[PDB]
């Protein structure tokens, strides 16, 4: 991995950052409120008489078990578009409140029920915001709403005109019934959502969790926060989820970040040996997966700790260096130099009787390569 990081076949002595260690999470619990009432859509999608287009209805679906699969696969719908969220992932999310609006329009007016359109319907009958989130469903209803002689009971604002629906109308003039589901998320504690299956609960293992919508990874631990009846979870400055409340038992649990750091490789150079030592940076050396040695800089594997002290060779950190000496690899607290007491007294002096002439070199960069790039040709 070091040879690959450097793009070479010979690595010289040093210490190289090679990747990023990381623990794996086991299991994938799923907490969700109890199971009761799968929502009876068979009232809004199964009504005997719909509502006009200029006074649409507005049903506020609420806490329930919603199964958008019976909708999505019913194959009876001529139009099923989802905007904020693709359809198959509806039975795996939870919101605060679903609204369902219902009305009846012509056949070729179903393309104005969408975010950002214009026309007599979207202008002033029913306007969808520009960041819509829900889904729009529509199906033909010629046999129910159109009657011989003209059904003049379905009006629209243009101040009011009436579709005269008749059974011998070409498609695109026959009545279509439309239902617009709009999922909203105010700031409550929870609400209706797909009924997966939910599961038990663990504590003290990297895990992949979902708490009624909150998807994450980490270790879960018993808390001692003083949450409030309105305070479920408590994020952290810089805005990361750190605590949750379990919906079923209503207890606060902290969410720690699975052990993760960096991995460095210490090598004496491939022209000396192919042995290697490995530093897991600021990781406690008991959770890494011979010589395991704990440092203020992390856990070191593959070097032995000696009691001598040499001049620093390969710098590990916090006063620790490594060398290939003691044939193998080892660690130690580098030495600053040899000790020396000067024979100081108040009437003693040292005077030199000889000298040496010394010549030493000093090297300095003056210049670098002059390069130009044509910005356009690049």
């Amino acid at each position: 991995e070091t040879k690959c990081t450097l793009k070479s076949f010979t690595v010289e002595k040093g210490i190289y950052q090679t990747s990023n260690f990381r623990v794996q999470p086991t299991e994938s619990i799923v907490r969700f409120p109890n199971i009761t009432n799968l929502c009876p859509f068979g009232e809004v999608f199964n009504a005997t008489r719909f509502a006009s287009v200029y006074a649409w209805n507005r049903k506020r679906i609420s806490n329930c078990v919603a199964d958008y699969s019976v909708l999505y696969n019913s194959a009876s719908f001529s139009t099923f578009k989802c905007y904020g969220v693709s359809p198959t992932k509806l039975n795996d999310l939870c919101f605060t409140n679903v609204y369902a609006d219902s009305f009846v329009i012509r056949g070729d007016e179903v393309r104005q029920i969408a975010p950002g359109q214009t026309g007599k319907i979207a202008d002033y009958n029913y306007k969808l915001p520009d960041d819509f989130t829900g889904c729009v469903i529509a199906w033909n209803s010629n046999n129910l709403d159109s009657k011989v002689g003209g059904n003049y009971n379905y009006l629209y604002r243009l101040p009011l005109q009436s579709y005269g629906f008749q059974p011998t109308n070409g498609v695109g003039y026959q009545p279509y019934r439309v239902v617009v589901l709009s999922f909203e998320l105010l700031h409550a504690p929870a609400t209706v959502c797909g009924p997966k299956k939910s599961t038990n609960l663990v504590k003290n293992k990297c895990v992949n969790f979902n708490f009624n919508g909150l998807t994450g990874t980490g270790v879960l631990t018993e808390s001692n926060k003083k949450f409030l009846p309105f305070q479920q979870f408590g994020r952290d400055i810089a805005d990361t989820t750190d605590a949750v409340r379990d919906p079923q038992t209503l207890e606060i649990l902290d969410i720690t970040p699975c052990s993760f750091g960096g991995v460095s490789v210490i090598t004496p150079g491939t022209n000396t040996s192919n042995q290697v030592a490995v530093l897991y940076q600021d990781v406690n050396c008991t959770e890494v997966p011979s010589n395991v040695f704990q440092t203020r800089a992390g856990c070191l594997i593959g070097a032995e700790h000696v009691n001598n002290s040499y001049e620093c060779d390969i710098p590990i950190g916090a006063g620790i260096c490594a060398s290939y000496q003691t044939q193998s690899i080892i660690a130690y607290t580098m030495s600053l130099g040899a000790e020396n007491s000067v024979a100081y007294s108040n009437n003693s002096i040292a005077i030199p009787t000889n000298f040496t002439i010394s010549v030493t070199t000093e090297i300095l960069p003056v210049s670098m390569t002059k390069t130009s790039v044509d910005c356009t040709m690049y």
Binding site: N97, H187, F230
Partner: protein
């Protein structure tokens, strides 16, 4: 009469715990050092954007509010009441007395004379603050009950208001009133504007202090 709030009408903008973190928010608040009406003991007021509402007593003369646009039939309204039993939220089309109240035998409730088309029901000294707001068909109510060591004057201090209720009504509101228990045998009204505040959070997660960032240059 009119009076001066000092630092009053701060509510938790939402759930989500929190500790020592001078967190900054933009919302509808009651500005610091404001001009709050004074009422003694009452009339139809406006709403226009939320309402602060305090009250002081040991008995219970303040027995809920009534809301809406017309406070009558032909359009829907809310009604929040409390007899000596407990709270009664209700949403019908009513016919409200132009001077509606309840007595204190102890027979009462000359409040309305109609309860048609009900679309929501529910049944079951002192300083009692309330913040009422109405956004996206939800009617939110924050509240707090502090004990004064006076009887009926607006004190000074800091006390954040915790959310109580949430009603998915859809109702339009433009006016509101009050309800009082007569004699047979003091309250204020602020309004809320879009301000920006700096809230100081304790280590338990409660708001202990705040800064209104549009009062003066120091703020």
């Amino acid at each position: 009469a009119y009076t001066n709030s000092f630092t009053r009408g701060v509510y938790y903008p939402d759930k989500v715990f929190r500790s020592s973190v001078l967190h900054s928010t933009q919302d509808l608040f009651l500005p610091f050092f404001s001009n709050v009406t004074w009422f003694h003991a009452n009339p139809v007021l406006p709403f226009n954007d939320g309402v602060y509402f305090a009250s002081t007593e040991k008995s219970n003369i303040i027995r809920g509010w009534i809301f809406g646009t017309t406070l009558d039939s032909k359009t829907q309204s809310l009604l929040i009441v409390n007899n000596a039993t407990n709270v009664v939220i209700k949403v019908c089309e009513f016919q409200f007395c132009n001077d509606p109240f309840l007595g204190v035998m102890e027979s009462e409730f000359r409040v309305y004379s109609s309860a048609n088309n009900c679309t929501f029901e529910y049944v079951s000294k002192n300083l009692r603050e309330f913040v009422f707001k109405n956004i996206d068909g939800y009617f939110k109510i924050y509240s707090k009950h502090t004990p004064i060591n006076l009887v009926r004057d607006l004190p000074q201090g800091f006390s954040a208001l915790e959310p109580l209720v949430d009603l998915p009504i859809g109702i339009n509101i433009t006016r509101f009133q009050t309800l009082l228990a007569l004699h047979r045998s003091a309250y204020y009204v602020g309004y809320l504007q879009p301000r920006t505040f700096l809230l100081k959070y304790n280590e338990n997660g409660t708001i202990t202090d705040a800064v209104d960032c549009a009062l003066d240059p120091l703020s």
